[PDB]
Design a protein around this motif. Structure first.
Motif, PDB file in Angstrom:
ATOM      1  N   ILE A  76       0.813  -1.207   0.000  1.00  0.00           N
ATOM      2  CA  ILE A  76       0.000   0.000   0.000  1.00  0.00           C
ATOM      3  C   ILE A  76       0.853   1.267   0.000  1.00  0.00           C
ATOM      4  N   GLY A  77       2.034   1.185   0.606  1.00  0.00           N
ATOM      5  CA  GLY A  77       2.899   2.338   0.738  1.00  0.00           C
ATOM      6  C   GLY A  77       4.348   1.961   0.931  1.00  0.00           C
ATOM      7  N   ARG A  78       5.226   2.933   0.770  1.00  0.00           N
ATOM      8  CA  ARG A  78       6.642   2.704   0.984  1.00  0.00           C
ATOM      9  C   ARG A  78       7.311   4.042   1.224  1.00  0.00           C
ATOM     10  N   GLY A  82      11.290   2.120   5.233  1.00  0.00           N
ATOM     11  CA  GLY A  82      10.540   0.879   5.176  1.00  0.00           C
ATOM     12  C   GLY A  82       9.372   0.978   4.218  1.00  0.00           C
ATOM     13  N   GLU A  83       8.213   0.512   4.666  1.00  0.00           N
ATOM     14  CA  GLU A  83       7.027   0.426   3.818  1.00  0.00           C
ATOM     15  C   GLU A  83       5.802   0.069   4.661  1.00  0.00           C
ATOM     16  N   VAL A  84       4.616   0.372   4.147  1.00  0.00           N
ATOM     17  CA  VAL A  84       3.366   0.022   4.807  1.00  0.00           C
ATOM     18  C   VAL A  84       2.683  -1.079   4.007  1.00  0.00           C
ATOM     19  N   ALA A  97      -3.333  -2.369   8.675  1.00  0.00           N
ATOM     20  CA  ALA A  97      -2.216  -1.817   7.909  1.00  0.00           C
ATOM     21  C   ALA A  97      -0.935  -2.010   8.714  1.00  0.00           C
ATOM     22  N   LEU A 101       9.621  -1.096   9.544  1.00  0.00           N
ATOM     23  CA  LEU A 101      10.769  -0.206   9.532  1.00  0.00           C
ATOM     24  C   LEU A 101      12.012  -1.033   9.523  1.00  0.00           C
ATOM     25  N   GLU A 148      -5.026   0.189  12.304  1.00  0.00           N
ATOM     26  CA  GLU A 148      -6.321   0.367  11.644  1.00  0.00           C
ATOM     27  C   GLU A 148      -6.161   0.791  10.187  1.00  0.00           C
ATOM     28  N   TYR A 149      -6.365  -0.148   9.283  1.00  0.00           N
ATOM     29  CA  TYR A 149      -6.310   0.152   7.873  1.00  0.00           C
ATOM     30  C   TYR A 149      -7.149   1.371   7.529  1.00  0.00           C
ATOM     31  N   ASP A 196       0.420  13.922   2.325  1.00  0.00           N
ATOM     32  CA  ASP A 196       1.075  12.631   2.545  1.00  0.00           C
ATOM     33  C   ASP A 196       0.619  11.932   3.829  1.00  0.00           C
ATOM     34  N   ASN A 197       0.375  12.706   4.887  1.00  0.00           N
ATOM     35  CA  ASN A 197       0.223  12.148   6.228  1.00  0.00           C
ATOM     36  C   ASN A 197      -1.211  12.200   6.721  1.00  0.00           C
ATOM     37  N   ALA A 209      -1.243  10.091  10.168  1.00  0.00           N
ATOM     38  CA  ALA A 209      -0.717   8.725  10.180  1.00  0.00           C
ATOM     39  C   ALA A 209       0.803   8.527  10.305  1.00  0.00           C
ATOM     40  N   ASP A 210       1.584   9.555   9.986  1.00  0.00           N
ATOM     41  CA  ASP A 210       3.010   9.502  10.288  1.00  0.00           C
ATOM     42  C   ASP A 210       3.276  10.520  11.377  1.00  0.00           C
TER      43      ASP A 210
HETATM   44  O1  LIG Z   1      -3.612   2.768   6.096  1.00  0.00           O
HETATM   45  C1  LIG Z   1      -2.805   3.310   6.814  1.00  0.00           C
HETATM   46  N1  LIG Z   1      -3.000   3.276   8.137  1.00  0.00           N
HETATM   47  C2  LIG Z   1      -2.120   3.869   8.990  1.00  0.00           C
HETATM   48  C3  LIG Z   1      -1.025   4.516   8.557  1.00  0.00           C
HETATM   49  C4  LIG Z   1      -0.728   4.603   7.130  1.00  0.00           C
HETATM   50  C5  LIG Z   1       0.401   5.260   6.630  1.00  0.00           C
HETATM   51  C6  LIG Z   1       0.635   5.303   5.259  1.00  0.00           C
HETATM   52  N2  LIG Z   1       1.730   5.967   4.652  1.00  0.00           N
HETATM   53  C7  LIG Z   1       1.911   7.330   4.730  1.00  0.00           C
HETATM   54  O2  LIG Z   1       1.134   8.039   5.372  1.00  0.00           O
HETATM   55  C8  LIG Z   1       3.107   8.003   4.047  1.00  0.00           C
HETATM   56  C9  LIG Z   1       2.803   9.355   3.328  1.00  0.00           C
HETATM   57  N3  LIG Z   1       3.362   9.291   1.941  1.00  0.00           N
HETATM   58  C10 LIG Z   1       4.311   8.140   1.960  1.00  0.00           C
HETATM   59  C11 LIG Z   1       3.675   7.131   2.928  1.00  0.00           C
HETATM   60  C12 LIG Z   1       4.693   6.357   3.667  1.00  0.00           C
HETATM   61  C13 LIG Z   1       4.812   5.003   3.422  1.00  0.00           C
HETATM   62  C14 LIG Z   1       5.764   4.287   4.149  1.00  0.00           C
HETATM   63  C15 LIG Z   1       6.552   4.938   5.099  1.00  0.00           C
HETATM   64 CL1  LIG Z   1       7.721   4.022   5.975  1.00  0.00          CL
HETATM   65  C16 LIG Z   1       6.409   6.297   5.339  1.00  0.00           C
HETATM   66  C17 LIG Z   1       5.467   7.004   4.619  1.00  0.00           C
HETATM   67  C18 LIG Z   1      -0.288   4.694   4.425  1.00  0.00           C
HETATM   68 CL2  LIG Z   1      -0.017   4.771   2.742  1.00  0.00          CL
HETATM   69  C19 LIG Z   1      -1.394   4.047   4.879  1.00  0.00           C
HETATM   70  C20 LIG Z   1      -1.633   3.987   6.250  1.00  0.00           C
END
Ligand SMILES: O=C1N=CCc2cc(NC(=O)[C@@H]3CNC[C@H]3c3ccc(Cl)cc3)c(Cl)cc21
Lengths: 396, 383
Positions: A76-78, A82-84, A97, A101, A148-149, A196-197, A209-210
């Motif tokens: 879903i994210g990176r 690390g990555e989400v 979610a 790290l 919580e996704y 982003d956050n 979320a961050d």
């Molecule tokens: O469903 C989520 N639930 C909680 C937190 C969360 C966080 C993120 N990711 C982000 O908010 C950041 C903002 N843009 C890049 C993305 C990101 C991804 C990985 C890392 Cl390590 C840091 C930041 C995503 Cl997408 C989905 C969720």
């Protein structure tokens, strides 16, 4: 006498405590890691040690919530560190979610203390403005945070799939003005506001979320930091003049970012965008000047009077004192929600979800696992696992 | 093998004191690191400093709740050994009175071995027998291991022998106490009047176990180094340079002998000789005359291993004529009254024990040594 035996059990149960059940394990667990490279087994003491535990530990490692316990859906994210991931709990088929790290990266890279502030908050914040942490834990390679996704999606994306109308703006801006006062109230300055956050839940409502910056203010609202943090286009002047060692700022800075949000949202680009980032630097410090606008007044007197009240000098920014003053500002005047209910109302956008795992609001990713870095096998003790000792948190 | 599953499997391990990872064990490791790291020389490591940052103080408070040795009122050094010493003391809090032996973490490392106390702890604390001294508490610090055990006003059975309806009683109890051990899967390997203590009621228990070794499923043990006391060690233990419990009985004969006689049945001006003495048990075995049953017992223990009273089934030792009597019986011996009864003035009468009068301390490390790792998990709060 019995002033202790009681005071003790608290410590071994209190999720806020540094030495609670799962903590003490993390330490023993870590030892077992940072010692079991044969090069050290050459120490009577160390050997005699792994002997006694090794096996136990291994079993303890089977019971504790291991990464395996999760089923990986899609990336879903990176991010840098690390990555989400979107996951279903292979046992209780729950879908969360799970952000990973890099114990490696985070050592290689200068700082590896930012996640403490995050975990503590996401887990204890208890507020629909903050994403929620359910579990946290580690192996020798990663930290995992299960949350919580948010089927909703980032708001940077919603501004890549719409043309936000002022009413929608007022609503999003207000939720963010709220979300933040939450964090402010827990004595934290965010320090990296931006789309982003800001994510959305099943009901098109926002949370943050961050917290990869979050710092706790002193008893008088301030903080004594001395290195810039955030993202070029948003960071405020104070946090650029941050440059060791005069960095000394409070709440106010998080509002500036708000201005940038509000801006990019109605307009289309950041108020300090620059073909050369290095320029965005000059721009920000010239906010007084540099602040231009679309010669086509496609905007409100109230929107402007807000923005250019946020994007003003710290010494004098909407909210320098009291969130009240931002709230009772003209721009928010309306009749479709009320501050004390905004979230109960109906978000400007709602999740058109096909299922529990509709990752349609999130732009698909490659999914490389383990590819990156690998810790080196040492010639003696280094204790790489020691600063992640205590991370683990089960609850409920 | 399921979320709800392991999560059950887990709790046990955190609660069952026989577990190596019980609550009180976890802490010891967390505690130990804090010791073996706090040396400036190392705090020059980013991780290691950042770490003590996060705990050092927390741990310091945890060290104040945990049973620290301060918690006790020192009475008098009722005992003393190579590796440390035993002490009588009153729990400064609940004024209770126990016997707290200390071990030297220092000496135990400098001295080649530091594993013997595990057998001890395990036993003294889980034995649950009137035959074994009991362990209430155990714990440590950067310098010593402590064992809080039931005091024995009674005293050692070699002190009693410095002040046969009497000997058949002691020897019987020792024969019984020892079978307890064997049944636990342990072979003591160091019987002697030094390790025999008497309670408020003149009844005996065993006190030291820093020797015991667990026999494999075949009642045998695969050792190859001698332990014990010279005048007692059995022949097969000297040729050690694989066996079983039978050797603990050999010692029994050595007790019965010195008990009736006056000195060991292999005494020597030069202990050195005592070696060949015991090896020639057949011959060397001298004699001053008391009982025909006494003798038939003795020269049935001091027999060659492959043929010793109790080779198998310790019932045969029981059903040996020497024990035939009418004032106690196997399944009551303890209930009876002891040939000698503690004439105690109070709870702290150290009369039966002869009042007794380096002090090496670890070297500060120039890198990680981890000298507290081998004693991680010792700590034992029992009920
Ligand atoms: O469903 C989520 N639930 C909680 C937190 C969360 C966080 C993120 N990711 C982000 O908010 C950041 C903002 N843009 C890049 C993305 C990101 C991804 C990985 C890392 Cl390590 C840091 C930041 C995503 Cl997408 C989905 C969720």
């Amino acid at each position: 006498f019995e002033t202790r035996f009681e005071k003790m059990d608290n410590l071994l149960r209190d999720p806020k405590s540094e030495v609670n059940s799962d903590c003490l394990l993390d330490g023993l667990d870590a030892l077992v890691y940072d010692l079991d490279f044969p090069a050290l087994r050459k120490n009577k003491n160390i050997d005699n040690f792994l002997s006694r535990y090794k096996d136990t530990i291994n079993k303890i490692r089977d019971l504790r919530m291991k990464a395996e316990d999760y089923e990986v859906v899609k990336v879903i994210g990176r991010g840098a560190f690390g990555e989400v991931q979107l996951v279903r709990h292979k046992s209780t088929r729950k879908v969360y979610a799970m952000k990973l790290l890099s114990k490696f990266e985070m050592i290689k890279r200068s700082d590896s203390a930012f996640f403490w502030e995050e975990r503590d908050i996401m887990a204890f914040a208890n507020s629909p403005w903050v994403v929620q942490l359910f579990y946290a834990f580690q192996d020798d390679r990663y930290l995992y945070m299960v949350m919580e996704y948010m089927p909703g999606g980032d708001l940077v994306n919603l501004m890549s799939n719409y043309d936000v109308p002022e009413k929608w703006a007022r609503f999003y801006t207000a939720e963010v003005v709220l979300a933040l006062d939450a964090i402010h109230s827990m004595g934290f300055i965010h320090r990296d506001v931006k789309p982003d956050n800001m994510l959305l839940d099943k009901s098109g409502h926002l949370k943050l979320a961050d917290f990869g910056t979050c710092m706790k203010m002193n008893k008088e609202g301030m903080v004594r930091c001395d290195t810039a943090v955030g993202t070029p286009d948003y960071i405020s002047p104070e946090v650029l003049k941050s440059q060791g060692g005069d960095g000394y700022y409070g709440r106010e800075c998080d509002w500036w970012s708000v201005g940038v949000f509000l801006y990019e949202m109605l307009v289309g680009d950041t108020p300090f965008y620059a073909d050369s980032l290095v320029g965005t630097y000059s721009k920000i410090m010239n906010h007084k000047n540099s602040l231009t606008f679309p010669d086509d007044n496609d905007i409100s007197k109230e929107a402007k009077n807000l923005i250019c009240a946020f994007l003003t000098d710290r010494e004098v920014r909407l909210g320098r004192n009291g969130v009240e003053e931002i709230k009772r500002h003209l721009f928010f005047k309306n009749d479709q929600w009320a501050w004390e209910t905004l979230r109960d109302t109906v978000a400007p956008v709602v999740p058109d979800l096909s299922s529990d795992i509709d990752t349609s609001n999130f732009d698909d990713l490659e999914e490389d696992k383990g590819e990156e870095e690998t810790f080196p096998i040492p010639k003696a003790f280094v204790g790489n696992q020691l600063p992640f000792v205590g991370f683990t948190y089960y609850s409920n």
